[PDB]
Amino acid sequence: GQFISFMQEIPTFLQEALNIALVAVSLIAIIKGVVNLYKSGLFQFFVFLALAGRSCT
Amino acid sequence: GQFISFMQEIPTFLQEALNIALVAVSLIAIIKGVVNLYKSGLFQFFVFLALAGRSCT
Amino acid sequence: GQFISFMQEIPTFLQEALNIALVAVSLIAIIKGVVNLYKSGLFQFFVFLALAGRSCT
Amino acid sequence: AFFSWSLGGYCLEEWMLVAAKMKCFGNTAVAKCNLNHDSEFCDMLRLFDYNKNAIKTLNDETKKQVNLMGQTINALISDNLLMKNKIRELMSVPYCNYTKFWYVNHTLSGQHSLPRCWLIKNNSYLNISDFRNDWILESDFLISEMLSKEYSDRQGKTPLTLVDICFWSTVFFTASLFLHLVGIPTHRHIRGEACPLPHRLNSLGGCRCGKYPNLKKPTVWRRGH
């Protein structure tokens, strides 16, 4: 439950430049990772498997 | 010789989820790195240099 | 000013293999990053914007 | 036995506290004076522990009619601290008389500081305007102590060798990533011609199978076809 404690204590920990830097880096990395996964096409393969045999569009 | 001590004490350290997670990540990274090196072709260049002048197959 | 202190105390800290390994890794990473940025072409886009409307060469 | 605890912990009941209730202190907080000889709170705590164990022994009915000596009391209370307090009193500077203690509390996780002695002067209690400079320092030290305690708690479980191996594996993975990203030329192509593979040309522009004559034709390293 350390995540819950951190979400409770965000205002106190936000006062440090290192803290905001690290959290910004993590958020940017997570969203870029989502972008790269999308640009991969593994999800496209899963959709293709889930679509095979339903419609030819 | 810390590596030897770790290889001796694997059974005690295996009882932690963080430990198994880290070792699994390291092993996966090492084998994927081998795969990527193979897919590079630097080894192919070394083989080409070691083959130049022997046979034209 | 920890950077200045480190640049002052380089000769004492150079005596450790881990230290030279880490600094070599960092320098190699920085120069390779410069190389990769060059090979990207974002700087090429900036040059293109700074050149648009001056000459058609 | 007595107060030599080697580590939800120590609690005190009604006949000890003036509020006539029961309060419990965390084991981490209590352990901070298992070796300290300069804390008024823990001397009084040892006195109360001796009282409780005397009660227990009377209940056990040992019946050893042993008269108490002053030496036992002198071996529980830091006489140096008492002399220091009396010296302070004679010099007209603030001191305390083992009655009231205060601490900074951390409500989120129940962590608290070790109580200090609320100093007196001229038969009065030092108040907020003079005691201000201590609560802020105590609270900052409390937060720092909590963070360091959690860091050490996770520290004492994971081998450093595993961390180092993981880091080096990561750097190797990244180097291989870039190395695959750029790619390396594999063979030679004659300038203006197509791919001569599988016939691998030499530095002279020809092949040893006879298909490509040694005409000193220009050759350029290429990766793809």
Add this chain to the structure above:
Amino acid sequence: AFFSWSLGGYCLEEWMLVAAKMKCFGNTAVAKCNLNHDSEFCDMLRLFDYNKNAIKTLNDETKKQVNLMGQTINALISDNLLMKNKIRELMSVPYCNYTKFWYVNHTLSGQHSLPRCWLIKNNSYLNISDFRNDWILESDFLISEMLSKEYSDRQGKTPLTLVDICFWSTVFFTASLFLHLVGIPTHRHIRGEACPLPHRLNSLGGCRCGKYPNLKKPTVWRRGH
């Protein structure tokens, strides 16, 4: 009050030092004996603090004509340490008499070690050739202490959870990087034919729109067109 400092710090003036000047010690260095009962330097420091506070009380003119007792002095000096030193003297081994102290200094940041006692023997001072084995150890310990102090100073500010989240985000980013780098086949191509998209072929080689008949033609997974 007296020497129980809970943390540019303590300074001593002319009438304390033989050099007739003023020297200041860092708070980190001074705090190292707020609980130590085995350091000759800090016993003498407590004596000098008592002298200074007596001066201050006389200036305040409390006029309490209280005769001094030997008990107050015995409650400031570690009598155990004095007895140990006298035992050493009777046994003809080196000892010190609270006059001269030495320390290793760090000029770059002003950090210094806690002074030790320059031991004597036969009414002389132990010299460099016998005292060598201590300065090197003291200096190494000083550098190690400085590095550890800085590490703990940054340690007590940043939550470990944030570090762990950053590390896991980085490893996820790298895995996604490679995963995009290689790329995965998306659809099927009949061997020898062009791209049948958007008509998505089945495993049988045909399409359910009727454009591609079910002729059991060979199919290979491909990513690009």
Add this chain to the structure above:
Amino acid sequence: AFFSWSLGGYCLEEWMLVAAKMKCFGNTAVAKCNLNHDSEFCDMLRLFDYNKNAIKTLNDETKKQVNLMGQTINALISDNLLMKNKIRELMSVPYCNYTKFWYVNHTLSGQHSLPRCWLIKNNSYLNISDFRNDWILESDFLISEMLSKEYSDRQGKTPLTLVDICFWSTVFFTASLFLHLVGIPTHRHIRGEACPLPHRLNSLGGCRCGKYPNLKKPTVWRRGH
């Protein structure tokens, strides 16, 4: 001199141990009571050190016929601890009499805990069924102490600034890796036409060299040719 060691170490010979042999303790283990005044083992160790140095001084033949006082012995043994033990005995609770000590041993690296006192009761020795709850705690603390000691040993050598620089260099390298992986469009292509390079078109669809007229033709950003 005497027992104030500032850090394969201290060893004891036949006439000290009941087993009539010689045992050596690690310096890290021994150093744990250079300031502790609450350990029966180290008081007896100081007594034995005084005996050994008396032997050495007699061998030196100082011939100082100085009669021993009880004060010297009282300045070596923690009289507070002795009074506590006697209080325990009078109260019919377990205690120890400085004869038998036990410790948890780590065979792989030779690391051991500091010996404790095997408590007695009713002229007998407390046995395994009552002493169980301590060995497990001692062993866990031993392993944690070893891990923390190694972590601090590597901690006190490497500057944190270097670690931070390495981490930031790694994150920059990864960002550049992705940034090269995707790639950015470089110039403009007229919809349906070929690559107009090196003639760099404007936003209007033409070129300022006159080759491409300003016909407001559609333009799309492209990277490759």
Add this chain to the structure above:
Amino acid sequence: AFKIGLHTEFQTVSFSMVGLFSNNPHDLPLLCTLNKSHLYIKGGNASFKISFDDIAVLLPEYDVIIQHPADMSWCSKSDDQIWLSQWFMNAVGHDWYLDPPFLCRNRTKTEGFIFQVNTSKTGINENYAKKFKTGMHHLYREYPDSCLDGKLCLMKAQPTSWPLQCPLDHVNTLHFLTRGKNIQLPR
């Protein structure tokens, strides 16, 4: 008890002296101050009241001049009272064979128990006045001194009942037990 900073609170703890002083199985000495002249000491079954004023009640030409602790046995009928008297005098720091004596009444009278000490602040006795002074300064944790540089300052001690209002001080008990040795407290 006011909230301090954020997520951190301020709370104090105070201990009760009645339980400690009424729960310890062995008896303990009690020292008390009432108003500014009524000083009280209690040990075992002897409860003495001490006052300082300018009245002479014993004279060397009429009663016992106590010079040695052996001679103390002629002042009381109870061993507990004699033990408490010697206890207090040695706690104060009186040297029997080096300082001027004090006066006591002999047991063969139906009057009671009274003992008087001269602590005047003039003449030779001035010096003694210092010593004794400091003594009391190290026991009661305070000293409501009730005699100035006037001609006489005579201290009288007399046994009375224990008032049921005295503050239950304990620093005085600690100092009492700390100073003197070879003392066993009964039940």
Add this chain to the structure above:
Amino acid sequence: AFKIGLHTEFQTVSFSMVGLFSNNPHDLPLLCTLNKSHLYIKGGNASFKISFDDIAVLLPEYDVIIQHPADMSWCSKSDDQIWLSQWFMNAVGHDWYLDPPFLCRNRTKTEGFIFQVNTSKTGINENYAKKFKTGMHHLYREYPDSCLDGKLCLMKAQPTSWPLQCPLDHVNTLHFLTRGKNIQLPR
């Protein structure tokens, strides 16, 4: 010595008392218990045996009633024995000029050395019996008490040879040296 957990072993260490007690260049006091009545003390060259029983061997109307330590000089012919006797009596915690005396034999007899203490458990002496009791309770680390509430409990001390079987206790030596002061041990 059983293996505990994994890779960790259990081992104990025990020290030998004979080397310490026979190696220290200065002499040290010895206190011993034998069976349940033979208590032994030894210091310098004086070896005393102490027993508790119901036999009267000295009477106040026949021998010396020791009241002051100066009067102690008439009981022995050796300074070491006198020093040890005073040492033990002050370690036990006897107040010479405040408690009932004890009896000793005068040197001008060819009998020997004997001294007797009354520690009966009745009458007035009951109280004294407490004090002395606690004394011995703080030295021998144990107390095989050998006299109940019976009419008399007389303690006798007499010098005998040192038996070569006594356990070499040392907690008693520590307490002996701790309690009394201004004591120099010879060689």
Add this chain to the structure above:
Amino acid sequence: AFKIGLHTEFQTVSFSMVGLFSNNPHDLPLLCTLNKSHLYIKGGNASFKISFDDIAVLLPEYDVIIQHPADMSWCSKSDDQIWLSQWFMNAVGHDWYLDPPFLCRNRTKTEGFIFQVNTSKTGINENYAKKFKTGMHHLYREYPDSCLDGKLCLMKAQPTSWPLQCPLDHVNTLHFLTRGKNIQLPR
């Protein structure tokens, strides 16, 4: 003060004793050694010089044989000198009613103040010579002993003015204040 290693320097600190010894508001005892025979003690307003040699100046058949501290009052005219004498004798560790006495001059003479102790190194007194010896060994931090196994070693103490050259030792002051108790230092 030589540079050690790199970036680290060697520096020492030494404290001045004159300020401490001349600044403390209360008076403190002083002990000094001059040449190898002139031992000096000073307390309050009494400044005594101690020497050891082979001259007899007092005889038991001519002056006072001090046996008890009460009898000490016949040797001086000043309370400070008597207090310092008793202070020193109890610091050395002399048992008044157990060891051979020492000799002093009675006040009713216009000569002065002198007191003599026998610490010869032969006969019975040999043993006493040990005790006293150790005493001085624990106060002066040194001992320039000035009497060998010769027939007599008599110590004489006489009050003189304080020389203005004595080293301002303080370990001796610490040991002096540590050993004895119930001592109040005046201003």
